[PDB]
Amino acid sequence: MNIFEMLRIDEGLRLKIYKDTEGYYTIGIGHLLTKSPSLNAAKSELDKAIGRNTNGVITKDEAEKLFNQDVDAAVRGILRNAKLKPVYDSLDAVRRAALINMVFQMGENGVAGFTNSLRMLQQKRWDEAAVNLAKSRWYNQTPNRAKRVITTFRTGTWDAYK
Ligand SMILES: [Cl-]
Ligand SMILES: [Cl-]
C-alpha cells in the first residue's frame, strides 16, 4: 500500500463529470473541477485541464495523469506550508500518507486549520490526536473515510485499508 493506492480506494475513479459529496463538479480520481454550479463552467475547466475538447468525458490515462499531478501538488503544498512541514517532517512514512490524504481532500488551508490535532501528531500522542480529529465537520460529513485516515494516524499501519 502507498499513497496512490490509498487515495484510489478513498476517491474511486469516474470517467464522466460527477458531483462529489459536497455537490461539486469533479472527475477522475477526486479531481475537483469547480465549485461553480454551472456544468458548463465544469466542462470548460475540464478541457483547459486536459488540453482537448472533452465533452465531459476523459480516458483512464487522462484521469491518472491528473491524479499524478494532484498528489505531487499535495506533497509540495505540505512542504511549502509553515504549519504543515514540521508535522510532516516529524512523521513516519505511513502517517505521512495519512496527512497527504487529508490535504488532497481538503486543501492545505483546511488542514493547516486543525491546529490542536497537528500539535498532538507532532508530539506523537496518537490516541489523543485520533480523538480530537473526530470532532470536526470532516468526520461528521464523511465518517467512513475519516475513520480510515484516523486509524492510520492512530496505529501507523495500513490496516484500515486492508
Ligand atoms: Cl489542473
Ligand atoms: Cl465516508
Curated annotation (Swiss-Prot):
Annotated EC = 3.2.1.17
Keyword line: Antimicrobial, Bacteriolytic enzyme, Cytolysis, Glycosidase, Host cell lysis by virus, Host cytoplasm, Hydrolase, Viral release from host cell
Q: Which Pfam families match?
A: Phage_lysozyme
Where, by residue number, is the active site? 11, 20
- Which top EC class applies here? hydrolase
- Conditions for induction: Expressed late in the viral replication.
* Superkingdom of source: Viruses
Family note:
Belongs to the glycosyl hydrolase 24 family.
Q: What is this protein called?
A: Endolysin
- Give the originating organism: Enterobacteria phage T4 (Bacteriophage T4)
